[PDB]
């Protein structure tokens, strides 16, 4: 009949087209459709991107020379790889990609159905699936369902590690390899000790986790915590102190989750930049610290082969050219890489003793595989241009390389930042809307006009 | 068992493209929703079946 | 000569797609032929 | 590479990852068709 005959306009909803998804706040059926359809987009990308990666994948080049971020995630789970991270079978990558892609059709189907065909609101259809954002008990119930789902997800990682082939362990004795985890770390003093570690240098908070036993045991704890917390919220309603402290509205809840995801995004940025245990350098390339350490190692090896006594070699500043002390005395690599002495990696640790780098082991025990690894990592440092010219900013064109660690750290810093902006946006708006002045100041009742002047 | 697999996957791709356009059009279309509903059922069932056929036939090529 | 017979949303969609194609061609050219570094 | 049986579908696999971007663009085609009401 008329252009404005539906409720999908500013005239009916109060929201302009550019805020059109706000028209869904109290339309649980269509909002369900939007959410399920969006989950389809996430799953779609995971499937399609994996098949793209696999179609472009040359198994004899390192993954990190090929712009891959998803196959490294699958390989870290122990699928498709053997000793040293060599690709022994691409079919697991194919399976993950296909199954995600197929599943995204199901999610998209349900999303499109609920978005334009199914009931627009669910409350008349079902008291179980219907909800009011202001119903605090219903909100904690749905929260609890999803906590249980998340806890199960954490236990799937545990099951993979302990019962279905293990995980890729860059630290495995004798060289990186897939390894079944049989003794996950359950001692809460260790597990929650990570949570109380300083985030600063040499400590690194949870980003410092450096063995798969702690990783797997941590996911046992998180799984049980989430399942217990989910049961708790299904069986309880918010306490008085919580009721009085929070805003209780759809937009407020969205803002809490935006703040949470922002924080997680920043954490992920630091994880992929510094951690080489759950982001194995075999798949993701060396970390920044790692490649800087590997350069010092490379020229220590070269110059020592030429006859240099690298322990007694004084550099131009008076500090050792190759070896010096950290501020607490440990023997570390010299030059600018003095800043990176907290680095730890499987190619370097055989040279480390109780007091730091061991001059005797350096003189006598460096193996060719260590020279190879240090050279490889020195020349795949995570530096490169936006158009994927590998090297320092003054490099000439030649090498097509930007490390997966740079791509993953930068993308998630950008995303985490805007999600913090979104947290502030929606948190401020939710406060103003609950108090009734999100549309502006009431001309007939302007608060400041009833306040005493400041002076 | 043969390389008939290439057909079933082609059928799956074609059927998918047909559903991708037809399903939203049908869901938002006023008339002929009775006829559309049965077609969406049939297309969906054939789609699921082709996924299974390709998945099984995968292991013969 | 009467306006509206070609809907503006179709004009905008087709025009935008044309912009995307032509700019996409220019980005392709950054990797092939002159200016590709190769 | 994909398993050789699927190789003929290589050009389609090359294009699929971009489809999510098209969904964001489709929202604007749709909104233009309803006059951004």
């Amino acid at each position: 009949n008329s252009i404005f005959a539906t409720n999908r306009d500013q005239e009916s909803s109060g929201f302009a087209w550019w805020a059109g998804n706000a028209r869904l706040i109290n339309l649980s059926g269509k909002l369900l459709g939007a959410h399920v359809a969006h989950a389809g987009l996430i799953v779609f990308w995971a499937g399609a991107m994996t098949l793209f990666e696999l179609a472009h994948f040359i198994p004899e080049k390192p993954m990190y020379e090929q712009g891959l971020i998803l196959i490294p995630h699958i390989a870290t789970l122990g699928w498709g790889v053997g000793p040293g991270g060599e690709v022994v079978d691409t079919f697991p990558f194919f399976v993950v990609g296909v199954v995600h892609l197929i599943s995204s059709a199901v999610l998209g189907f349900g999303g499109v159905y609920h978005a334009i065909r199914g009931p627009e609101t669910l409350e008349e259809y079902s008291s179980f699936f219907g909800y009011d954002w202001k119903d605090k008990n219903k909100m904690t119930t749905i929260l609890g369902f999803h906590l249980i789902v998340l806890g199960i997800g954490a236990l799937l990682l545990v099951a993979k590690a302990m019962f279905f082939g293990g995980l890729y362990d860059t630290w495995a004795p004798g060289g990186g390899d897939v390894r079944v985890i049989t003794n996950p770390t359950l001692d809460p003093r260790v597990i929650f000790g990570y949570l109380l570690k300083s985030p600063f240098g040499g400590e690194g908070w949870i980003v410092s986790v450096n063995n798969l036993e702690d990783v797997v045991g941590g996911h046992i704890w998180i799984g049980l915590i989430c399942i217990a917390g989910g049961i708790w919220h299904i069986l309880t309603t918010p306490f008085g102190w919580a009721r009085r402290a929070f805003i209780w509205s759809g937009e407020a809840y969205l803002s809490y989750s935006l703040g949470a995801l922002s924080m997680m995004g920043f954490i992920a940025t630091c994880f992929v930049w510094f951690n080489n245990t759950v982001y194995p350098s075999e798949f993701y390339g060396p970390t920044g610290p790692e490649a800087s350490q590997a350069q010092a190692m490379t020229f220590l090896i070269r110059d020592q082969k030429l006859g240099a006594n690298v322990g007694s070699a004084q550099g131009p500043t008076g500090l050792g050219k190759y070896l010096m002390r950290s501020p607490t005395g440990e023997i570390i690599f010299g030059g600018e890489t003095m800043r990176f002495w907290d680095f730890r990696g499987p190619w370097l640790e055989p040279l480390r003793g109780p007091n730091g780098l061991d001059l005797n082991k350096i003189k006598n025990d460096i193996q060719p595989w260590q020279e190879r690894r240090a050279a490889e990592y020195m020349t795949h440092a995570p530096l490169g241009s936006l158009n994927s010219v590998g090297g320092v900013a003054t490099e000439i064109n030649s090498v097509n390389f930007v490390s997966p660690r740079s791509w993953l750290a930068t993308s998630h810093f950008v995303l985490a930042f805007f999600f913090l902006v979104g947290h502030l946006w929606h948190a401020g708006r939710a406060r103003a809307a609950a108090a009734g002045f999100e549309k502006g100041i009431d001309r007939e009742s302007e608060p400041v006009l009833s306040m005493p002047s400041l002076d | 068992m043969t390389i008939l697999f290439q057909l079933a996957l082609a059928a799956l791709v074609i059927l998918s493209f047909v559903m991708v356009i037809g399903v939203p059009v049908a869901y938002a279309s006023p008339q002929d929703w009775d006829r559309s509903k049965q077609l969406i059922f049939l297309g969906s069932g054939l789609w699921i079946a082709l996924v299974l056929v390709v998945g099984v036939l995968n292991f013969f090529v | 000569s009467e306006g509206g017979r070609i809907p503006l949303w179709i004009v905008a969609t087709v025009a935008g797609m044309g912009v995307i194609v032509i700019v996409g061609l220019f980005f392709y050219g950054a990797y092939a032929g002159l200016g590709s570094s190769l | 590479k994909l398993p050789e049986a699927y190789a003929i579908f290589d050009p389609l696999v090359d294009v699929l990852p971009v489809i999510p971007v098209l969904f964001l663009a489709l929202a604007f085609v749709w909104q233009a068709a309803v006059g951004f009401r």
Binding site: - | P24, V25, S29 | - | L26, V29, A33
Partner: peptide, 30 residues
Amino acid sequence: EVIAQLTMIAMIGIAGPMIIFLLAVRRGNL
């Protein structure tokens, strides 16, 4: 195959606006 890749993204790219157009013609629930 640049011709194949371009044809694929053409039919995929046309599918979206085609849905909107078909519904506009059918005076559907846009």
